[PDB]
Amino acid sequence: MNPKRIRALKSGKQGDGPVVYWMSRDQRAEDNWALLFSRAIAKEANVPVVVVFCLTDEFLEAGIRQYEFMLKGLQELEVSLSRKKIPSFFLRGDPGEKISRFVKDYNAGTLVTDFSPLRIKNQWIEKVISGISIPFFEVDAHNVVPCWEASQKHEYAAHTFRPKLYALLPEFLEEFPELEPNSVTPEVETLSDVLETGVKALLPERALLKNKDPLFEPWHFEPGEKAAKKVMESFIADRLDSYGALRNDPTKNMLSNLSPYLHFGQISSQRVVLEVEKAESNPGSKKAFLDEILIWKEISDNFCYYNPGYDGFESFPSWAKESLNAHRNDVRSHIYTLEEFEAGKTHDPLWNASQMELLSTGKMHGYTRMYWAKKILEWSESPEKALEIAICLNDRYELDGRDPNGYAGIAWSIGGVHDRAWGEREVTGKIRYMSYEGCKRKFDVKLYIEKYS
């Protein structure tokens, strides 16, 4: 176990009670460095490990599609941890109040959590630190190379982050040790009841069409650790060979469809990389897929960790901020409100089709996501308004939303983060432009539009 994966958030006097793993981002029992590190510290102090998950007050800012996908995975996860004799405790409320109360009530010895560079997780960490006196650690269980180890600063391009990450792959890309069970079982409600009351609170804001029928289709992605491994296995056996050639075709289901599991932490990216690396397939397709799950996925964490305003106009590159400012007063071709963007009521059928796929499946195709966000910038009153509209629609309806990938993806599409300057245009400036005619020359746009009416 590499000690570079764990960081100390607060020193203190160790108690003699169970080591608490405050699971937030990596919701799985297998291939979890944070859970393995908690078990090892628990073994060293002769004390069992315990698992605590907080059901926060911010679930109403999202939809039923993410609430059910997350909770249905936790229901499977509770069974899996119980078989290895680790108990799980699900608290409802503020992590700053619930974690501090749980630590004091249960005489917790050491507190451990997983790593997340999002602002809301840092808000919880500040509150928890102020109310505990035991040691507090955090472990990077989401990235193959720890976020603080891959780079010590913000990387302005993938070609500058790629050699750094690949040089540390031989050290950090390793097999996971088996999660040992607790020696004996140690000494706040049923998740089914919490899911029932939560869904009832989210029903009035459900995404419906004119016929009052729900718009979301929940049969596209089954949640759970077991389902994530089946989707991963299918991708390697059926879709990895053709990934490098058809990853930009939204009319083909050639993507891995691993993002909803990767976002909630139901499957480890390191596990996916290990299986992909030992598979035999198209080397161009393997290189393309590893470039997406290693470089671009972990550079998103690098973006949010080293840019406090990762969701603001200030984090854009200087060339993009100057270009967008020089085109602020340019007359936009069209101006759509948030409701018009949300309902897919724009003049562009391709954009509307992309929005319908987001509304119905909860997972828009990777290529159309770039077109979807770049057209928001073209049809907004300001780049700051486009950032708000893109982030709102992304986090509300994407099953993988509220993720560092989305904010880094949105920053690339609108602010040119991790991109270069292109030909200068009106309104958009030097930001990379994607036209409707360009998409038609790339794939069958008519089929994609007809699929999502």
Confirm or deny that 258 is annotated as ligand binding. yes
Rg of the chain (C-alpha set): 22
Binding ligand FAD (rule: CB under 6 A), the pick from 263, 286, 418, 430 is 263
* Contact between 380 and ligand FAD per CB under 6 A: no
| Bridge partners, 10 (sequence order) | 136
Confirm or deny that 405 is annotated as ligand binding. yes
* Contact between 405 and ligand FAD per CB under 6 A: yes
Residues in the interface with ligand FAD (CB under 6 A) total 27
149 CB contacts (<8 Å, ≥6 apart)? 4, 168, 172
Around Cβ 439, how many Cβ atoms within 10 Å? 18
Binding ligand FAD (rule: CB under 6 A), the pick from 113, 300, 302, 352 is 300
4-34 burial, b for 16+ CB within 10 Å, e for fewer? ebbbeebeeeebebbbbbbbbbbbbbbbbbb
- Min dist CB 410 to ligand FAD, Å, is 5
Confirm or deny that 325 is annotated as ligand binding. no
Binding ligand FAD (rule: CB under 6 A), the pick from 296, 319, 422, 433 is 296
* Contact between 413 and ligand FAD per CB under 6 A: yes
* Contact between 257 and ligand FAD per CB under 6 A: yes
Nearer to ligand FAD, 51 or 293 (CB): 293
- Min dist CB 404 to ligand FAD, Å, is 8
Binding ligand FAD (rule: CB under 6 A), the pick from 256, 315, 354, 380 is 256
* Contact between 286 and ligand FAD per CB under 6 A: no
The tokens describing 421, both together, are 């300057």
Residues found in the chain: 453
Task: Find the discontinuities in the chain where C to next N exceeds 2.5 angstroms and give the residue preceding each.
Answer: 187
- Min dist CB 145 to ligand FAD, Å, is 15
* Contact between 430 and ligand FAD per CB under 6 A: no
* Contact between 355 and ligand FAD per CB under 6 A: no
* Contact between 403 and ligand FAD per CB under 6 A: yes
Nearer to ligand FAD, 357 or 398 (CB): 398
Query: Residue 42: CA atoms inside 13 Å, Cβ hemisphere, count?
Result: 27
Q: What does DSSP say about strands 88-92 and 111-114: parallel, antiparallel, or unpaired?
A: unpaired
- Min dist CB 407 to ligand FAD, Å, is 8
- Min dist CB 276 to ligand FAD, Å, is 10
* Contact between 258 and ligand FAD per CB under 6 A: yes
* Contact between 400 and ligand FAD per CB under 6 A: yes
Q: What does DSSP say about strands 136-139 and 111-114: parallel, antiparallel, or unpaired?
A: parallel
* Contact between 434 and ligand FAD per CB under 6 A: no
- Alpha-carbon distance of 89 to 168, in angstroms, equals 36
* Contact between 28 and ligand FAD per CB under 6 A: no
Closest residue to ligand FAD: CB criterion: 409
| Bridge partners, 21 (sequence order) | 51, 112
- Alpha-carbon distance of 3 to 6, in angstroms, equals 6
Q: Where are the alpha helices (DSSP H) in 295-382?
A: 297-306, 318-326, 338-342, 349-361, 366-378
Q: Three-state DSSP class for 14? A: coil
* Contact between 259 and ligand FAD per CB under 6 A: yes
- Alpha-carbon distance of 264 to 403, in angstroms, equals 9
Please report where in the chains the tokens 């077109």 appear, as a residue. 371
Binding ligand FAD (rule: CB under 6 A), the pick from 18, 244, 317, 401 is 401
Return residues touching ligand FAD (CB under 6 A). Answer: 247, 255-259, 262-263, 292-293, 296-297, 300, 366, 369-370, 373, 394, 398, 400-401, 403, 405-406, 409-410, 413
